[PDB]
Amino acid sequence: SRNICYDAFVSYSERDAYWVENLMVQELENFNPPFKLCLHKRDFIHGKWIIDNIIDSIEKSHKTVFVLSENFVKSEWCKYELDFSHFRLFDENNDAAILILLEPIEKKAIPQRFCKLRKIMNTKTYLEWPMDEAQREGFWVNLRAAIKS
């Protein structure tokens, strides 16, 4: 396109919206230099359809960031379990997604048909949002690193 690319497309839920739209934005969009983000629940076109918003954002951004939380799992995850004929390269070998664990998640409760997700949890690969405020600086450092990895 003209230059309408993005560093990351961030999918998350409305309940976690404050964190993403304040905390993450200040550490990324307001970083220096800054990152260009497509925020799932802030930049989606109203008229445009759902699947177009998703597929389109994903394709227009270098990476996809999932902000995992109990609520995000119940309310937004499924669409990401079962996917269909669009990534001619299969997301499984397409840079992989960046996962952020905003809060802990009782994987016992996590369905079981959520194969991808369960893996994720076990693989224990994700940037865990620290309870200790003294350790959040490092977190953002890791986040930016990952997005630009």
Resolution (A): 2.8
Give 70-106 as a DSSP string.
Answer: HHHIIIIIHHHHS--S--TT-GGGTT-PEEEESS---
Give 7-72 as a DSSP string.
Answer: EEEEE--GGGHHHIIIIIHHHHTTSSSPP-EEEHHHH--SSS-HHHHHHHHHHHEEEEEEEE-HHH
Q: What tokens were used for 136? A: 């959040």
Domains and CATH numbers, the chain: 1-149 (3.40.50.10140)
Q: In what order do the strands lie in the sheet with 61-68?
A: 37-39, 6-11, 61-68, 98-101, 127-128
Q: How far apart are alpha carbons 117 and 96 in whole angstroms?
A: 13
Q: How far apart are alpha carbons 17 and 23 in whole angstroms?
A: 10
* β-strand pairing of 6-11 with 127-128: unpaired
Please say whether the beta carbons of 129 and 115 come within 8 A. Answer: no
Please say whether the beta carbons of 7 and 36 come within 8 A. Answer: yes
Please say whether the beta carbons of 99 and 119 come within 8 A. Answer: no
Nearest 5 degrees, angle CA 34-CA 36-CA 37? 125
Residue 90: which region, alpha, beta or left (left: phi > 0; alpha: psi -120 to 50)? left
Q: What sign does the dihedral 80-142-125-72 (CA atoms) show?
A: negative
Please say whether the beta carbons of 9 and 57 come within 8 A. Answer: yes
* β-strand pairing of 98-101 with 127-128: parallel
